[PDB]
C-alpha cells in the first residue's frame, strides 16, 4: 500500500498485514511468513503469535526459543459432497519444536489464548531423538506438504516427519532420518503426485541431495547425492586463491528446469577485509548422479561479512531473463542474467532487523521486526 521505490528494475513496498511490532516485550523474535498458507508467525520465549497476511492468534507454550512452522488446513481434494459451512473456517495448523519434543496443533483456532497445560491436550506430540543435553537443537524447518515436514538440527541430523497418515487424518510420526556439519538449505521441489514431492538439501560441506519424500506409504529415496565443494573451489581458485580455507556455502535454490540449482557461497580476502559472494549455477544429471558448473558470478554491490551468527542469507528466484535476489541482513541484492550479468542493490536502514522471509511466484517478502512486511518485486 506504500511504495518506497519503483524503477524499471524493481518495486519495494509495504504489504499491509496483521503483523504488529508490539506482539512482545522481547527484542529477539523468531518468525517467518508463509504466503501459500496465508499466515505469518513470530515467537519469543513464551508465545507464538500467528497473524493473517490479509487484514491474531496467541499460543502460549510455557528457556531458549522454540522453532515453529505453519501447516496447511486439512484439504479434501475432489469430494463428491457439498462443502460444509464449518469447513470454510479452518485456518491450518502449527508445529512447535520445543527441545526434543515436537508439538503439532492440527487447528490453531481452538487453542487461541489457551494456557499450555490445557492446549497441549489438543495436540499430537512426537519425541524426537534430539540430544538436548549435548547442545543439540532444531535449526531449519521446511513445510514440504503434501509429503510432510523436514527438520534439521544444528548438528547435521535431518528428520522427515509425517503429519497425516494414508487417510488424511492428523498424526505426528518420524518417517525417516535422512542421514560440525549442518544443513544450510531445505528447499521444496516439484510435486510428483498424491502425497509426494521432491526436497533439496544442501549442507555446509557442499553435500547436495535430492530426496523423494511421501506421506503415501512410500519410503524416502535419494535421486541425487553429490558433493559440490571442490568443484566450486576449483571454479574460483585461479583468480581468488584466498578461496582456499574461506569458501563457505550459504544457500541454494532450484531453477526453472528442475535439473539445475543455484548456490550462494562466499570467500574472504584477509588482505583487504573483503567478503565476496558467489552465485554458482550447477546442472545435475540424475541418470549418472553427476553435475557440472554452468556459470559463476561474483556480487559487486555487497562485500560485507555476515557477523550475526544467527542470520542466514537467502536466495529468491521468481518463477528470457533470470532474476536472483539475495537477502542480506540490511540489503537485498538483485542480479539478472540472460536466461552479460547486471546487478542492483536495495539498501535498508541499519536500525531495522529482518526476522524472516517468505515468497510467492514473483516477489520476495521480508519480515522486519519494526516495520512489518516489505515486498521486493523484481521486474522481468
Amino acid at each position, epitope marked *: 500500500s506504500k511504495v518506497f521505490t519503483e524503477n524499471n528494475r524493481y518495486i519495494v513496498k509495504t504489504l499491509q498485514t496483521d503483523y504488529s511490532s508490539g506482539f512482545s516485550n522481547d527484542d529477539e523474535l523468531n518468525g517467518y511468513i508463509d504466503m501459500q498458507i496465508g499466515y505469518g508467525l513470530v515467537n519469543d520465549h513464551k508465545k507464538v503469535y500467528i497473524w493473517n497476511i490479509h487484514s491474531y492468534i496467541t499460543v502460549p507454550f510455557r528457556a531458549v526459543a522454540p522453532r515453529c512452522i505453519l501447516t496447511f488446513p486439512a484439504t479434501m481434494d475432489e469430494s463428491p459432497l457439498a462443502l460444509n459451512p464449518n469447513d470454510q473456517d479452518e485456518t491450518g495448523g502449527l508445529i512447535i519444536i520445543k527441545g526434543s519434543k515436537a508439538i503439532y496443533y492440527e487447528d490453531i483456532n481452538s487453542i487461541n489464548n489457551l494456557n499450555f497445560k490445557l492446549s497441549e491436550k489438543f495436540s499430537h506430540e512426537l519425541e524426537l531423538p534430539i540430544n538436548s543435553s549435548g547442545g543439540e537443537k532444531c535449526d531449519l524447518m521446511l513445510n514440504c506438504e503434501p509429503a510432510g515436514i523436514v527438520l534439521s538440527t544444528n548438528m547435521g541430523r535431518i528428520f522427515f516427519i509425517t503429519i497425516r497418515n494414508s487417510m488424511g487424518k492428523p498424526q505426528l510420526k518420524l518417517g525417516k532420518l535422512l542421514n560440525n556439519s549442518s544443513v544450510v538449505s531445505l528447499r521444496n521441489g516439484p510435486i510428483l503426485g498424491k502425497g509426494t514431492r521432491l526436497v533439496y538439501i544442501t549442507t555446509n560441506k557442499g553435500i547436495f541431495q535430492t530426496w523423494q519424500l511421501s506421506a503415501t506409504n512410500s519410503h524416502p529415496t535419494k535421486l541425487i*547425492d*553429490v558433493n559440490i565443494y571442490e*568443484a566450486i573451489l576449483e571454479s574460483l581458485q585461479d583468480l581468488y586463491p584466498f578461496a582456499h580455507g574461506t569458501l563457505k556455502i550459504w544457500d541454494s535454490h532450484p531453477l526453472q528446469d528442475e535439473s539445475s540449482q543455484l548456490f550462494l557461497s562466499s570467500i574472504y580476502d584477509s588482505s583487504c577485509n573483503e567478503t565476496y559472494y558467489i552465485l554458482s549455477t550447477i546442472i545435475f544429471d540424475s541418470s549418472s548422479n*553427476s*553435475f*557440472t558448473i554452468f556459470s559463476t558470478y561474483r556480487l559487486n554491490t555487497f562485500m560485507e561479512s555476515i557477523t550475526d551468527t544467527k542470520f542466514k542469507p537467502k536466495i529468491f528466484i521468481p518463477q528470457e531473463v533470470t532474476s536472483i535476489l539475495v537477502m542480506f541482513p540490511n540489503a537485498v541484492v538483485i542480479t539478472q542474467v540472460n536466461s552479460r550479468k547486471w546487478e542492483d542493490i536495495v539498501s535498508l536502514r541499519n536500525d531495522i532487523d529482518i526476522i524472516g522471509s517468505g515468497y510467492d511466484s514473483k516477489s520476495l517478502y521480508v519480515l522486519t521486526k519494526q516495520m512489518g512486511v516489505l515486498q521486493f518485486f523484481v521486474k522481468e
Partner: nanobody, 120 residues
Framework: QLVESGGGSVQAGGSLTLSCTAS?????????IGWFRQRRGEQREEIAY???????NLGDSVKDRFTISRDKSNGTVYLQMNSLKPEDTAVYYC???????????????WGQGTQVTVSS
C-alpha cells in the same frame, strides 16, 4: 577418445613434440588439455596444461624447456619438448580436465600414454 602421438627415443639435448587430438564431444566436456608424466615406480604428475582459451601453464621442472600450444585450426594441442634430459624418461599421458563431477570426483579423460626415452 583422446589420441596422443609423437613419442620416441632421443639423446640428451634432443627434442620431441607430443600431440593430443580430442574429438568434438570430449572438447566440450573439458576445461583444457594437459600432460602427465609418470616415471617408472613413481606416480603420474601434471607437467603442462593449456586452457581451451589458450592460457598455457608449465610445471617448474619443465617450464624453461617445454612449450605447450594449441592449433586452433584443428584444436590439436602440442607439447614441444626441447632441452631433453635422461630424467625426462617416462610415459607421458595427455589429459582432459573434466567439466563434469561425480561421486568419485572430477571426471577427467586420459590418453593411452606414450613412451619418451632420453639417453645420455
Amino acid at each position: 577418445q583422446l589420441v596422443e602421438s609423437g613419442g620416441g627415443s632421443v639423446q640428451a639435448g634432443g627434442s620431441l613434440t607430443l600431440s593430443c587430438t580430442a574429438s568434438e564431444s570430449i572438447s566440450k566436456r573439458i576445461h583444457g588439455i594437459g600432460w602427465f608424466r609418470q616415471r617408472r615406480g613413481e606416480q603420474r604428475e601434471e607437467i603442462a596444461y593449456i586452457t581451451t582459451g589458450g592460457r598455457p601453464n608449465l610445471g617448474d621442472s619443465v617450464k624453461d624447456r617445454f612449450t605447450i600450444s594449441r592449433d586452433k585450426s584443428n584444436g590439436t594441442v602440442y607439447l614441444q619438448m626441447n632441452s631433453l634430459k635422461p630424467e625426462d624418461t617416462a610415459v607421458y599421458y595427455c589429459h582432459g580436465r573434466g567439466r563434469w563431477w561425480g561421486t568419485e570426483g572430477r571426471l577427467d579423460y586420459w590418453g593411452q600414454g606414450t613412451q619418451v626415452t632420453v639417453s645420455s
